Amino acid sequence: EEASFLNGSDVVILIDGVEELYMEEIKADFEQDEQSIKLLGCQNEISRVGTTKGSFSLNGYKTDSKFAKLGFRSFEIIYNLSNSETLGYESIRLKNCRLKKLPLINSKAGEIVKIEVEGSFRGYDLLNEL
Amino acid sequence: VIDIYLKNEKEKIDFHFPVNPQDSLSIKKEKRFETVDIVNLGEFDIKKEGEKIREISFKTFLPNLYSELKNPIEVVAMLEKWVDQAEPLRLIITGFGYNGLVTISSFSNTQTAGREEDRDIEITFRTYRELKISNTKTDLKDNRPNTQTKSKIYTVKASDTLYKIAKNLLGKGSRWPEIYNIPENKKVIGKNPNIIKKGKLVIPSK
Numbered sequence: 001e002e003a004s005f006l007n008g009s010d011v012v013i014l015i016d017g018v019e020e021l022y023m024e025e026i027k028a029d030f031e032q033d034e035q036s037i038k039l040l041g042c043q044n045e046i047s048r049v050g051t052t053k054g055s056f057s058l059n060g061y062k063t064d065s066k067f068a069k070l071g072f073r074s075f076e077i078i079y080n081l082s083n084s085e086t087l088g089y090e091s092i093r094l095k096n097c098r099l100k101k102l103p104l105i106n107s108k109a110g111e112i113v114k115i116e117v118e119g120s121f122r123g124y125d126l127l128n129e130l
Numbered sequence: 131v132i133d134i135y136l137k138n139e140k141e142k143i144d145f146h147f148p149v150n151p152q153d154s155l156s157i158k159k160e161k162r163f164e165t166v167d168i169v170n171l172g173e174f175d176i177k178k179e180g181e182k183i184r185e186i187s188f189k190t191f192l193p194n195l196y197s198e199l200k201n202p203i204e205v206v207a208m209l210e211k212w213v214d215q216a217e218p219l220r221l222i223i224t225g226f227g228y229n230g231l232v233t234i235s236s237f238s239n240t241q242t243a244g245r246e247e248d249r250d251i252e253i254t255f256r257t258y259r260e261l262k263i264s265n266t267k268t269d270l271k272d273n274r275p276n277t278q279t280k281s282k283i284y285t286v287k288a289s290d291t292l293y294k295i296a297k298n299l300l301g302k303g304s305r306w307p308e309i310y311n312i313p314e315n316k317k318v319i320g321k322n323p324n325i326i327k328k329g330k331l332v333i334p335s336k
Contacts, residue, residue: 038243045243 014078023060030054059116088130097121132225139279140217151188187254194247202249206239218258231258288328308335
């Protein structure tokens with residue numbers, strides 16, 4: 001047993017090839033509409049794969065009008081997670097992603113102006129596997 | 131309490147449904163009538179004297195293990211055989227209070243994905259009726275359905291006579307020569323029709 005975990009401090013995100021270092025949360029999932037159909041002779045139901053759909057959520061602290069200016073244009077998100085205790089790093093890129101809604105305005109009381117972005121992505125590429 | 135009984139007679143089988151008819155029974159009744167319009171008066175309803183055939187339908191499942199029981203496959207084979215039966219079936223439904231001769235119009239079984247042993251059944255019945263094709267005078271009506279069946283081969287008893295066998299087993303009783311003229315009956319019976327013995331096997335016609 002050894003400590004080889006990873007921390008969000010190591011996260012590096014290039015929104016369209018630009019380091020959006022101000023994003024303090026990110027998550028992306030690649031789900032499949034697995035059809036499940038029940039066969040006559042088989043007791044247990046059979047699950048059949050289907051087409052995949054990529055969704056991603058990304059929220060941070062506002063520092064400019066980047067996303068509002070970006071609009072619904074297609075773009076790319078490159079995510080790099082690097083182990084610092086030992087060398088090696090994971091690197092992912094969402095092949096073609098679009099926003100589902102512009103967080104046009106958001107603010108409340110004395111709190112910092114947080115920004116939340118949600119969208120979908122067609123596909124992905126796994127550039128490094130650790 | 132509710133039960134369903136199908137008392138087939140051409141096959142002496144008294145089937146009792148293992149399972150009650152699922153969600154809800156229902157029987158319609160619709161008076162047999164026609165509509166006619168009359169100039170400067172409009173529509174009118176004319177009753178037609180005859181009655182109307184009405185249907186009873188429901189659905190069940192024949193379970194594999196349960197109170198008397200039988201295999202669902204054989205039961206389906208039993209009912210599917212009965213569908214083609216020209217003779218009528220007696221249907222009795224206790225709680226619904228239905229009792230009368232019917233005939234199965236349609237029948238269908240089904241094996242669901244699970245529960246492969248059971249067979250979901252959907253059955254429909256039609257009310258049955260009969261077609262009964264000198265010295266005119268009032269007499270008893272011929273309302274009684276004649277649903278009764280006997281073996282096609284008769285074993286003569288001690289007190290029997292050929293006329294008596296004809297009446298008990300072929301109706302009018304004067305029908306005895308039909309029994310006698312069959313060559314098998316002629317062979318077993320003596321040349322005298324009036325003489326007969328306990329035992330002799332005899333074959334009623336039809």
